[PDB]
Amino acid sequence: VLYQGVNCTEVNVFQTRAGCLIGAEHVNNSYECDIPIGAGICASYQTSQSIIAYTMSLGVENSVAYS
């Protein structure tokens, strides 16, 4: 559950920029937008299973081999 625009003081528990997010687990590693949340956070059911929440990855990074 996301409480949109709340600080957790007022309500696992995680503070996002979108709000105090409850029942999801914070993960530092970044992945595709599976479920959108807001302010770059997304959530998914990746595996032994729970809902995770993480900062989304915009795509694979690639330094083009220009000279």
Binding site: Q4, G5, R17, A18, C33, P36, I37, G38, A39, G40, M56, L58, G59, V60, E61, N62, S63, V64, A65, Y66, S67
Partner: protein, 412 residues
Amino acid sequence: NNSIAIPTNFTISVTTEILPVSMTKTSVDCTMYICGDSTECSNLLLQYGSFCTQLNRALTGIAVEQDKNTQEVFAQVKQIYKTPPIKDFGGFNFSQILPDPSKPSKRSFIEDLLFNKVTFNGLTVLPPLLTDEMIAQYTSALLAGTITSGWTFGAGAALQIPFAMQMAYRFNGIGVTQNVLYENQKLIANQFNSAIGKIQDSLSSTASALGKLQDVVNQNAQALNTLVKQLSSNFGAISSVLNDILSRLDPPEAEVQIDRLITGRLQSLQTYVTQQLIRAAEIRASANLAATKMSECVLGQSKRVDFCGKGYHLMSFPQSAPHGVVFLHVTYVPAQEKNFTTAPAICHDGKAHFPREGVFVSNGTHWFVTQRNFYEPQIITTDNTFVSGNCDVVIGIVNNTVYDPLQPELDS
């Protein structure tokens, strides 16, 4: 009927085009707006039915569409491309528009100018799905693809190509023979670098240049301020305040006064939601246009005259801006013409010759063929031209003698 003006020189130009892409995502608790959570009004509002729920459904449609717009505009790229350590793009600058490492959010210098110059009674504002930092990575990715790999990252994987050759391509795309770039590379790099420099001064000079983005920010503040001010309205009721009425009057009398406040506040909220549905359609028309210019002007080169800055289009660079996008369209403009005598075809020995590409001209004393968009005379020859029938049918043909470059070798 025998005069043509051909440009002997040109200017690279950089035209800044600014487009709205998204509104401030908004959702309103219609019960907290109308009733202030005071139960005697909520027990009346329940009797109006779907006018509670469907306004949140309508504003949720608007709120999701702001993320869909911003996704379609910026997330056209398949990978996050990033620029090499070396910056030797043939002399062409690429610094004020690439990321600045000192900027916390890795925006470019021109993105920072744009981010400076643009500027809860049951109402709620929702964050965008992509933060300003994430949008600034997509505008860096589209830019680093565009610098290192031309249009190829719009067709498949980015294929590297040296930047002077990518411009030689893009000249060859506007009917200028690519030698015109290489023979002028330092001048073209200086015209481009100077033209970028004028953008920083132009954007510094007045906030009135960003009017399209300052408008989408102003109109949403103006709509919500009016929606809040409409709480202070009677609509025929004894007072504009609900708990005041409920203190003054017995339930029978109070109910008729409150039902006016419900009707008035609800009609004001339907008016606001209807206006936002129409404003969101106008912003979506702008977001589809911006999503098109990413595809055609950034990821490509466009033949569409005056779709992509004035002059013939070479390339463009996107830069992010609050609630929108800015394109720096780079265009070739022909700039110093001379008048020349011309004829549609020439006669050799009993044969009409037409130019293969380019057009015939004379300085008044000699006849030449030149490419159409830059004066560069070449002696008229059997490879530069093709024959098509005798020396009669054409109107305004001239007499001449075409050189045939094989004949000196057939002297062997």
